[model samples]
Target chain A: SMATSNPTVVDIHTHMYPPQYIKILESRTTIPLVRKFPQAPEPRLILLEAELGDLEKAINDPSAKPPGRPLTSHFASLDQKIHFMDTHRIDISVISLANPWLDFVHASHAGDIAESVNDEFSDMCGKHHGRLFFFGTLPLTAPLETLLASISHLAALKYCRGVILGTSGLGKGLDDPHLIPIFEALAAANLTIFLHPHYGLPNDVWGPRAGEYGHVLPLALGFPMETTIAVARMYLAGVFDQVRDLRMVLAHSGGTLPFLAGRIESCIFHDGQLVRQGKVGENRRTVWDVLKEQVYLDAVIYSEVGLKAAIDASGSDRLMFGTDHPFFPPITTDEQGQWESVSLNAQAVAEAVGEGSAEARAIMGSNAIRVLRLE
Target chain B: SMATSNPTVVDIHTHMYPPQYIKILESRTTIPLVRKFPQAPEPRLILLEAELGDLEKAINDPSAKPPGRPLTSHFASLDQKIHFMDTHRIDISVISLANPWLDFVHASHAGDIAESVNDEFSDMCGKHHGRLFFFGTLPLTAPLETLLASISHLAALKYCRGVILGTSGLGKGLDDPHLIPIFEALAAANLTIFLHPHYGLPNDVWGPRAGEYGHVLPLALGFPMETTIAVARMYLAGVFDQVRDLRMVLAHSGGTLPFLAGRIESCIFHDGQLVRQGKVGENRRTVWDVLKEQVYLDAVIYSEVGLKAAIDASGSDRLMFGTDHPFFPPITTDEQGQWESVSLNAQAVAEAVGEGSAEARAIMGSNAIRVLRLE
Candidate 1:
């Protein structure tokens, strides 16, 4: 199953947590935690605001049971991941650390720990050879110099194709002036920024009784909204224009940017602040230009509707296949076999552009191989 | 165009401020106010947080400029709207009162004012005949009986196709259990709900530098997120499943619902709360069901990327054209000439499904005529 005579079907959105990272999460009392409850088979991992109620009840009453979710081996076990790949017929995976990636790491230890995480990822790839690649993690909490040094180290590391990043750049978001140099440095290093999102909107925005919806509201809407907000902020700040060399692969099919580009352009042109300051000139490069040129999108969106929209925004040559493994595992099905998450994405490609068509083939694996220079 | 000889290209997203409504804005002291500033040529009307800095500076510093944007006649003049529509080649317009639509009206006078506001819309449509239909407004802040009575009144109006509603239904959001009866009533009355958003996201989501972005972040990203969240909440509350006959036309192409449906589905499937309670059972309908069955999207999203996705998610028969006029009016070009906003949406339809093609024509006008019953 691991060996494919055809070009490898790369799953770039797959994720992992090394033993060390799991240790950190295990030690945590707040969000991004891994805890066990007798109510579930696996240790429940409660992440978002939607799980807050269950998490609260779990703590107060031993009889009441923990609130949150059950954590499972699917989250951290390599064997489980390989089994998942076998089940889904995924040939290769360019794995990365998942959301809130080291963003919460202490500033003092962020640099060294980032190195450890990167090394672990590199080692994982080395073990799997052609079946594995990785987008390295950066200790964004570290000083600018340390961050730069980590990037330089990862760029030279085997299987390090790019750097997976979250929206929270120095706590202000990707639009922060401080992150421009980081973008420039990543661009110079020939590393595409695999931009992901972690911090969703303020919980209040979900309205009262949001917990009743489970994680649907946040996972479905908040994640994309956070991503959209980040990229839009960057566009408004002229980050796309300023950092011409910057290349980014947005998670979740550009996070609604392609859908809302028209409104963004209208808002910008109609804005009094920019207009009064003489900024809404005719020559301003549109968001459309940035989308087609500077951005790539992961085929992690689990539907053909979104995948086609993504392909339209950025050419098929830039679209890449990803699984977002270790997250969104099949809760109802056999965890050791096929995962609906992976199949859903693969099916989306086949359905959107036709099974085994040139466009589908490109999006499924060839594009990733060509872009990352994978043999 | 008034004769409706050919299919009418209805602009469902079009907006207007009746003479009385404009007076209310003119008399207001806070935002939603139309006021003249000393430094501005046009009377400035500020409505958003991104404009606050300018408003504050203009108010405090004598040398600092005026607050808000120029209140051009495009805001309130029906003649200007007609000219704009004619220039854009729009055959008909189903205009409605724009955002914050009587949401802040005095509770005591809400019903009477809502009646007058809707009457004004009725009168305008009467003047234009087949060229102008309208989505009436409901005085949500009024007592339940008054609100239901307003709906009943709109039911009898000849040109009223539906009611334009904001996310806030009554004091709570659309998901509020209190609103189900209203939805049932509207559906029974044979009126589609034109769900729109005005109070975008919380200000913090835009970050500290949102002002620099000139309302683009909020308007572009925040507004859509608001709509998506509201709808997701409603879906979670089983609004669609409960009110089987209810139909909704979502503004901004379902506000990212089509793009995120896959994620929303996955989240629900994996949610422990829903799963344990058997809410995630196989027989349960997903977000996809609701989108394809109960919802219609306006083709106001400006990019082919998004338009195609909307079409893919919901069939072309369900996507109707909208201009969002009176809002994105031409700033650089003459208001009586071409409007980029109208053209952008038009171009998106053409680009997505091919110009002058059957699918394009269906989206451009035919769908709206059929859905809204503009006979």
Candidate 2:
């Protein structure tokens, strides 16, 4: 049941929020809150701007549409994670806490809460031994000393492979110079940063008719666009150059980075300011270099078109299979059954490379196994 | 030299402002304005939030970095456009007015101004005959009747093949129900809508360090993201299905739509609100279907990775060559000789498909010629 070794399916972008984190969210009155609405059976987890209007309505009227998604047990249960892995034939999942992870924790309690969350993850991984590993959460809201200490704690954890990060870094974006040492520390620790996006663009960008479309605009476009912008900001700030050893696994297939890398490079090369500032010299690494050399992308883009582009931008070996489990679960089908989200990614890998090819095998699991040292 | 006949290189995404439009921009006080700075050699066209800081500084202090991009001859001179074509070996160009096109025009003057702009484009095309075709500008701020009449004016023009449209439609987004008639009118007139992005996302998404990065974040990411959001909104509003004959040529390769379409579909399928409303039924047309059937993506994505993805999402036949001329002109090299922007897109086509393959030929010129009915 544990460590399906070499060539087995792996999902590195999967998420789980432990009970402690959920308890913290449940106590919150604002966003990242876990509240029960009269119209919904399970408690609702409202974390996004798209859910704000619905959150207010659900509070004022019991007949309103549920504010956010149901906080199903799949969100916090290790058994459910394994069950989902089994259901989807995923042998190993390097699970991490989902969005707004410890980002909302108070400065005074963040360090302790993060430590507790990391330990819970470590314990869960111990229960499943070789089948599980985790990306620890950082207490970013804590003081600088506590934050660095949290990183050290995670580095020492047996089951910890890396840390899951959001776009925001110390209330600023990832490009903040203040976070450079943190990136260096993680790089030194040989911990990969699973860069994910939660705070999408401003709500107004979705337009007045956004409510009519549900979460499609934010979830589909916003999440990926946010990831792209964050990473681009980091690249433009010379984050990769400064921390050459840094390795990042970008979600949503590098968040359109693969498709826009050439453009980014071109823009940089042609930018008068960057050129005048000596930032566009021959010695400087292009976006392509960073993508291919220091970055990895998950195969969760859900299309062969996107998957192929991702593989092209970063080599096939740099891409690892992922399911984004407990998130895009099939609504029309039984929750326990195969998720179309999983299959879509799988099919993309199959179509991008021949179904039984070594490239496909690598993307399916071997890449994750080697890169993340899963086994 | 005029026609260059069938199967020649055709750039479908080229843009111009004409002298009249430039004068209008010069008269404007806000963004989409042409203003001179003592530090700059030319009047800076400060149209984006990315340029706001520089604009402010340049206005207040002579030592500040010049605001916006240079309003060069390529932006307004027809001779320059033709010369650019000759330099790039492009045989024909389906030019349009660049972004913020008539979007800021007052309702009082919108109809007349649109007519003037459209006629200016018509005259330019007439001078070059078979080597040039134009996409007219629409006065979106005008009365509904005025707007439709402008469409009629464009349709009657022999050299006008389409209209260049910004995402904003009548103060709302492209998804506005009020736009269905406009879409239907353009479709019925066999006028393709070259959907472009003008207003990028709000300035905050780029973070505080955005100023240090030049315009790469906004132009590289925001433009495409804006386009993606606009198209997705239209799709959700059932604009494609409502105006079945609507034909659109998405700039910057559908603004990441090809890469994000699968996720968009997956999100829709899993959406509770959409499903409950019966919008996710079996009869619903997928984004893929619309992309392949009604949409054409320009080969302006600057990389083989993106070009391949665009081709895969919408068939090769539905993809067309575009230079995105007068913009992204070579800064390091002689602009009169050849533009890297042009070469990057051309190279992408050559690399994605074989240099001389049918698919490459289609993407390079034949697709645009056939689709736009260029003789």
Candidate 3:
């Protein structure tokens, strides 16, 4: 298991979109759709509302810059994943379908699509025995029975480690009382939920100048803030306590959670409603307790400063290395070679906790290995 | 000056709304208004949209919980400020009017009101001498000439150290090019801009269950995210570069800037539009450089984890102590005594760096003294 050996780097936050999932997107006309544009070389994958302006301009004017990002084969190809892993010297990767994952699928079709997507991921992991594992996709839009069934199926899959989830749960939020059972089902199966963000904040917050800045505001701020809000909502709703066995990994190093947890704790203590309701009791677990207990953070934050905070908030043992692959790929550099995105995170872990220290080794691989039971 | 002695404690993020400002709010019918509720002892100071539901409920039903926080005398009384400062061991506090700070004032009246508000702050500071300093308010809704004059008025004030600003600049955003000259004028005057957040993200992002969370999502997440978006907008707009002398202190430890700066930098480098526009030139300062060079973060964050990240991102010398006083006052304890909010931030400093270490001293007070010229 490399528990006492040289670190075996594991990329737990990496992603892949199954070909069938892309086919579903290609057939759709709305966002989370894959569309071919005359101005772009590859089909453009438009996932965010922030991309709508450019999407419109490109559709009408072939001369316009393509909207969204190019649908690179790295997004869907299993070989590319292995190559990316090899290039970055990642010994193992626990891959999941990239975000906006089955989120927009019609309810009737969601279950079937999620089933096939999970199967595809399971097949991919089967091909790379010991080198790959997967966090399965669930059709959240499907009926409760169907969703629970999907969880059961993924739990039975040999290479499945957990399920990857978006912030939107049953169309309201993770705070919805309806989500408690789903969380319970996943927990009962011992499948860690990788909570990622898709719907960022409302677009107006970006203001009129947002179009000029490209995707920085939404991708950088919106995504993480979304993750934090979702988790905070869950915490407020007592989802963590209700499902005591629930384990989850947060993307973007808990999406500002480490920094804001203190403020959240402060707010909870100062809240009139919660205090009056006797929710802030002596037995009440603060956000800090929840973070250290149920939450594990991915080391995808791009700086040592942030990485250090994530480690401080949740111990180094609770953090695992992540690449956020197929997204934030090097723009100026060769896609087939080492990615600056991957190196930035790796360098952060090294700088934050010392390159080859036991702490570094644990964050780099052993933590994920032990936590995910990858052995 | 205490340069030769042990560093004195200073608070740079404290707030106060003069009696006249409160009167203006009393006259208002919308948010940023203060009104007495039959059910509450003190008039409720309702500010955020997140509070509107409760405001309506309380208005219709006197038995309902008050809409916003109690408008304690601590908000408007200089004596209370001094008492609170003494209680918290804060030797100096740079006070300013709290949120929605004159952003809603009528343009015709904004300049007059701003003058009075600045004068009131000045008078308050003058009474306490070394114990008080202030960040003045601006009449942003007034004409450009009126706005410039207001800056001049503040610059000439004896105890005015800087100006407290919201994310909304000239009703557009800080990114609005029209606001650049304002930045330049403030820079030219050597007055630091204490950038704070008032209007958090649009209320919709809080979701349906937000009411149950009791301001945690907005105060904890929305506030910082708002500050971050505002700063990111300014960064993309070249506001920092255009006004080289423009120094700014961000409230709430830079509103997630320390954690997300790397992502912002990566996005800029990877942005096709920015690169093609030559905006991503080799000489362009990354967010890291800007954070260290021009930006200062307050140690108002509630946790040591966040304080450490703020220190690491911006040097300890660049981080200053803050309490966010008059707000987040002890809810469960006596208001006359120590505030948990102040202690939380103080404890963070003590924990992040050693309790009495030089680094901790800097963050606790010396940094504010040096940066704001609190002496």
Candidate 4:
């Protein structure tokens, strides 16, 4: 299994929260926290709206186990990160701040805090120059000039490839007109926007018995669907056409965009108002074209069926390998051992395009290196 | 490209509105209607919340074009229906009543009307035995007995392979306990469920400036998203696990289910509440298994990417080809000629699995013929 240096297996989808950030979480009583309870060995790490009911129960009832998941060092430590990369044959890593990043920062401290976080990430990349790069965090909670300055400062960092964004953009959405300049700036700097989903659809959409199904409905379906809805709104608003250089790497294979591209195009073409208004014409570039041209999808989807569909939609070259680390860690086995979640995706790549095949190799490592500029 | 013997290209996704149904639409001045506005050439068909904002303007101002799309003859005329099928090289069509079917009908008249619509579909099928079949409309608005009687009547109809249904079951939703009996009865009668989406997510989810995109956002993204949400809810309710034989053929390629199956699995395994409840154990069957076992996806998605994903998710044997005809017809091209929409799906089949391949053949005509018993 081991070969000479193995093409520097790069991981673009990893995440971390610095010790300073963990301190902030430890101080909070809400989710995204580390809390000790009599029931579990590891401290809890709650992070979604769907977990609120259980969190409430744990707080009121002494017998109740702690809410959220265990907040392990796997969530923040660089030593654990490098160990994870080593264990999985991953050489280089491009880590970023995970979800709900800076979205909740107070406006007054937003810029300074964002600067410190970006510096921490930059310092981490500096420690392992070739093996580590970072996607900077944006102070979306701050004023326009401060936000622009943050982007400019991040752009100057040696290893900053892009900025990871959540669906909520300044509280409106990604389609908010106010965000156009931000998009324009990101595009101008040649930074690929890694669009991720933090706030899923309204919890009610999961129905009354959703808790019985685990987080499958929300995390699996809700997350991707939320991503799809956000991007669709952007597409409808002509975001791609308006900002031609904006490179977006949609997580979980464009959150079903590849599969639904045809329907989206058909819907756009047959839309009466759009047609009557001359907005939808023969010359309009279809969603399929946009998918192939402007978008890149991560090969993080954990099935051969999905991986192949993604490759077909965006091309193998545009698909990058990712490990949604600190998330979907091994539940039944030791976290230090091989992760089933990571293996599922790796297996999908090997099975879908054949192990060691050119396409498979590209999706496994080289694609991220080139697309995210890990080289 | 023409072949002899007039290949029976069945359009299972086609829709029709009987003259009586059109009358019901005409009498109503609401969203679903046929109104002649001064700015439009023909009567218009208004069918979405996205168009309601302009309803007042179009109603009052003689200068404004109609709020909805044109209510072309394709919606109600049998001759036009045949012409459309013929024009698209479709030798046969299994038509069903359009959306809001009996959903908005008064509960009092529901039984009588359901009988009439079922009779009309039967009569239509009788006229072109070899070329027409239909999925019957259920009188969901009717009382339980009347609804059961409607199911019995549909079971007796030679052309009825299934009953087309919306996500709304009674008043609650598809996951409602009340809908279980109906599902059981349909399963007992060996009638499949042609689950479709009519009501999309709340309009607010689409955000402001939604009208600027026409029906593209709702129809393209919202419809499938709704269907996914409903089915996921049903699955979480253990409805599928309970009704082992209840077969469902999901529209729009399982509403993005195939693409997101792995995510759903990961979500379930890593969910704190679900894991605490012991629902996240290794023995649990995944959404992927259910998809492969109990579900079938129609190849109605309009592109190769989607079709391939659908095929990959469900396997070619469980995938069927369909044309959402009478909808998304060539708006700018000659209505009597080949439709780009139809070609879009058909071409997807060829591109996805390779033309003339076993998988492609299965997805094209054989799969539908086998699954729906379209002899």
Interface RMSD of 1: 1.4
DockQ-better candidate, 1 vs 3? 3
CAPRI docking class of candidate 1: medium
Give the runs in model 2 whose Cα sits over 4 Å from its true position: A1-6, B1-7
What lDDT tens digits, residue by residue, belong to model 3 across residues B171-270? 9999898998898899999889999999998898888978888878888888998999999998988888888889999999998999888778877777
Q: In every candidate, what fraction of the native interface contacts is reproduced?
A: 0.80, 0.85, 0.81, 0.78
| Candidate 3 Cα errors over 4 Å, as ranges | A1-6, B1-6
Ranking by DockQ: 2, 3, 1, 4
Model 2 alpha-carbon miss at residue B73, Å: 1.3
Indicate the TM-score of model 1: 0.95
Model 1 agreement with the true structure over A1-375: per-residue lDDT tens digits: 223336567777888888898888888988878877776677776666656777788777778756655567776778877787887778888888877688888898999999999999999889877888889999999999999999899889998999999888889888899998899999999998899987777888778778677777777788888898899888888899999999898988888776777778878877656776898877998887888888888888888888877777777887888877777766677777676777788888888888867787789888888888788
Per-residue alpha-carbon lDDT of candidate 4 for residues A192-270, written as tens digits (9 for 90 to 100)? 8999987888887776666666677778887888889899888888889999999999988888888788888888777
lDDT score for residue B125 of model 4: 84
Prediction-by-prediction clash tally:
9, 0, 0, 1
Relative to the real complex, the DockQ score for model 3 comes to: 0.80
Clashing pairs in 3: none
TM-scores of chain B, in order: 0.96, 0.97, 0.97, 0.95
lDDT of 3 by residue, A68-95 (tens): 9989999989999899998889999999
lDDT of 2 by residue, B1-375 (tens): 333234598899989988888888999888889987776679888888778777777777888778888889998899999999888888999999998888888889989988888888888898988999989888888888998888888889978889888888788898989888888889899999999998888988889989898888888888998899999999999999999999999999998899899889989998888888889999889999999899889888988989899889999999989888887877778889878788888889899998878898788888888889998
